[PDB]
Amino acid sequence: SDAERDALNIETAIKTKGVDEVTIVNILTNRSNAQRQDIAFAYQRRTKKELASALKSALSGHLETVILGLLKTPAQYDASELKASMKGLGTDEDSLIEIICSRTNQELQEINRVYKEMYKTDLEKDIISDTSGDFRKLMVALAKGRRAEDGSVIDYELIDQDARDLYDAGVKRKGTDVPKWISIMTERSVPHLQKVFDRYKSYSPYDMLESIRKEVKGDLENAFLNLVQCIQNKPLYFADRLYDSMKGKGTRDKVLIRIMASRSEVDMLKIRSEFKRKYGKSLYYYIQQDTKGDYQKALLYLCGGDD
Template sequence: MALVSEFLGQLTLSYGGEAEPKFPTVVPARDFDPARDAARIDTAIKTKGVDEQTIIDILTRRSCEQRKEIAFEYERYAKKDLVVALKGALSGSLEALMLGLMKSTAEYDASELKASMKGLGTDEETLIEIVCSRSNEEMMVIKRVYKDMFKKELEKDVAGDTSGNFAKLLLALVETRRDEPSNVIDYVKIDEDARCLYEAGVKRKGTDVATWISIMSQRSVPHLQKVFERYKSYSPYDMKESIRKEVKGDLEKSFLTLVECFENKQLYFANRLSEAMKVKKPIRKHIQKQLQRQHHLQCSDDGSLMLI
């Protein structure tokens, strides 16, 4: 636990909405020398009792791209796969953390999704969090990687593991039919969608979930942000309150996650992390998962690892 705390201590946590730039707290290391890092990791692994601190210091302070380069150099230098070597040298949550860092974000998501549906029962929370928070683009890569890794279509596994409206919503999201953001703001459409959401939910008896699903899975994020604003001129409750009133269980959680991510994805993850930190026990696994998920969100185009 001490090491995990130390790792956590190295991260700067903030809650979004602060002055720009909000996020990069871990940026690509300057004077980066992958061969030197690879050699240091090799020494750390060979040290009696394993020099865990050096491994943490290196891997948590390099960008995703840089970690890939280190792995490449390590294999040349030590004639061993770095992931295999880390597995052998580390254990417990530190092992899981470091191995997670070595995966690409899509690989990590794909394995989390697989694990959430494996065996009996389903870890709905993980399923919801990943499927409802990833962009179309991210989901497309996840689907490809999922198929490569597990030789099965993600859609099929999701369909086999969920049911009812919850399944319909997740599958609509996995289908990645969301519009790309447009330069033209379509006020007529915004008004129409806002009214439809209201009429399908708060205004009527019961809920026309299919309408909610189609609007929330197909419209672009900037469009939906405006729809939710407009929605308030029809409904006495805002979108999130309406969701809480209209639907329950996993479906409620999924819609809420979607809306929170549309509104402010960074804030959503900051809140999740903060919730995870409040839990006294058993927090380790939870925090570790949260950190890994943070790491997706913040793996920016230039490959720098950003943590909120």
């Protein structure tokens, strides 16, 4: 890599009359996150100005959102998105749910650490302040990032007991024992819960997702639905969330940008494979139909190719 050559080409594009957005996109969306950190360092040393601030002046619109997000480290970006989801008197529960429900223990440990560094308060405290009831209990538990790690031994006895407990806490009874659902679904390892959800189908006339829809409502329902999909098949979860961000009128750009940026370097090949298999056309194609301009170009580079 040549961070200083990239940093120089970016400054030229910034200072150019009208701004050369294509140069900025072509560079930043075709570099790894670590290469971008080096570019930003090299840029500050050359210009005495922060790259992120210089681009926030030089860009606007959805393109600005993409590019500024790409400049943050993965944990910084996640922490900033969590902060933004909680900003003001409301809560963006959909975004909070997406991040907390899909991040691994190791990702969440770094988010907790980085959040506190950037905002001087614990993530858990902001979550407690923005949520209430069982939804709060579930989000706070997940955010600890202390799910059991995948053991070397499959515990079939516990798989069966957990399935019965989920059934007895929900569909089988009047009302719902939500704390039993929260315990099992936050504490057990991911491969364990995968097996629990199939075993659950032996006891229950409905699968886990349909049981959630029948038993709970609102933010709690949304959160359990996202979590179960994340446990069952996380690349498919992101493929479905991307399809949902585009399928209808307009675009849920906040969701589309965040997924494309945060997964580009993690599992985007699997996301693309699941998307193409389910929807028959490529993720690339859906992005092309829903977005335009340099913004489109940036997302297509994060996609990484057709099919």
